């Protein structure tokens, strides 16, 4: 029960601190005023470097929401250095890979938003707010993604079950006015909320999506909504919460699901799943590939755990004592969070550094000891 539950929750929490100096080379912990459902490291660092994180607020109507830029002290604190005004909770927020100055958000009531940070470099607080509002959705969502080959093109996915594809390239933004933007495409191919979508890293038109309708689908954004999804397979028997393309292997991808597991997939054989990562004991909401090492990925869940997985170690055998503890591929389990985990982000500047968000206002920037990952 809940009361019984909490006591258990901490008591092992501070057992976790006790254990930290052996397990982590780094652990930064911040309590935020409001929660954040979204985190993403900015590329680049200044000089012991200092780096930047994209963040948001979840006021729930109670106060004004903020898209936030925070800076961290990395080899130890971190502070919020910019707050831009935001319509509704920042459901998720991602920078343009071509230009991290450009930010896309999914805001209140399904609205897309575009922020230009170059417009307000010096200001601590930007009240002006967004530079553009992406029109179409009618419920709120979390599926947001940017196109790596086509500058200025992005996809959104929502509880309204649609997927919209937008093109903001060439559209002037200014502190004068917020332009309205209409989708270039609108795809109805799901029967429930589109939970996550993502553009393929090395292909202009390939867009993958997953949903509560248990499907993994593959869309060719060149074809009009008149067409169907290029591929649609059942991926799990329960809702699929997340999808990630491997940044080194063009055909390898992963799905996180409410079945407590992560499935891995070869793109050209979506009819028979390659492998299943068990080991979470509640819904697996999120899944992310290391940008540094192809066999490495990370999963977070409602079981308040974050798991780091090494796929080299599959088809590998070991003592029963370890079988008690998990698969040979489970490398690291972060226990730093005392509530379900909202979002994660691999640090692209520093190998083996991760940011993670919990629903009880905690931000953590941590790194598993070098013992455990280098061999």
């Amino acid at each position: 029960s809940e009361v019984d539950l909490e006591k258990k929750i901490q008591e092992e929490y501070k057992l976790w601190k006790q254990n930290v100096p052996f397990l982590y080379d780094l652990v930064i912990t911040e309590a935020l005023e409001w929660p954040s459902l979204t985190v993403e490291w900015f590329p680049g660092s200044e000089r012991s470097s200092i780096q930047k994180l994209l963040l948001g607020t979840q006021t729930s109507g109670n106060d004004q929401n903020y898209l936030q830029v925070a800076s961290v002290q990395l080899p130890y604190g971190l502070d919020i250095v910019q707050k831009i005004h935001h319509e509704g909770d920042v459901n998720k927020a991602r920078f343009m890979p071509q230009n991290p100055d450009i930010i896309a958000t999914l805001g209140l009531n399904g609205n897309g938003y575009i922020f230009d940070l170059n417009l307000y470099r010096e200001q601590p607080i930007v009240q002006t707010g967004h530079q553009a509002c992406l029109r179409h959705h009618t419920s709120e969502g979390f599926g947001l993604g940017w196109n790596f080959i086509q500058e200025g093109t992005l996809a959104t996915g929502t509880e309204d079950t649609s997927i919209c594809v937008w093109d903001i390239k060439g559209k002037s933004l200014s502190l004068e006015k917020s332009i309205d933007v209409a989708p270039v495409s609108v795809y109805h191919r799901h029967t429930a909320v589109v939970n996550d979508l993502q553009f393929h890293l090395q292909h202009e038109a390939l867009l993958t999506s997953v949903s509560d309708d248990c499907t993994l689908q593959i869309h060719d954004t060149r074809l009009p909504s008149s067409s169907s999804a290029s591929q649609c397979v059942k991926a799990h028997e329960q809702p699929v919460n997340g999808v990630a393309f491997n940044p080194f292997n063009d055909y390898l991808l992963a799905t996180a699901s409410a079945d407590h597991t992560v499935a891995l997939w070869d793109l050209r054989r979506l009819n028979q799943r390659l492998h299943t990562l068990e080991g979470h004991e509640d819904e697996v909401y999120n899944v992310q590939w290391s940008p540094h090492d192809e066999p490495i990925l990370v999963t977070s869940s409602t079981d308040r755990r974050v798991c780091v997985w090494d796929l080299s170690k599959i088809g590998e055998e070991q003592t029963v004592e370890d079988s008690e503890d998990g698969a040979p591929e489970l490398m690291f389990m972060h226990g730093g969070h005392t509530n379900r985990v909202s979002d994660l982000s691999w640090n692209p500047n520093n190998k083996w550094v991760l940011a993670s968000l919990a629903d009880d206002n905690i931000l953590q920037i941590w790194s598993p000891s070098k013992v455990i990952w280098a061999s």
């Binding site: 052996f22 397990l23 370890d322 489970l330 690291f332 598993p368 000891s369 013992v371 455990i372």
Partner: peptide
Amino acid sequence: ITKPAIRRLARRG
């Protein structure tokens, strides 16, 4: 504590 015990502690959480 020692490297093996560390590497399994990483897996029990």
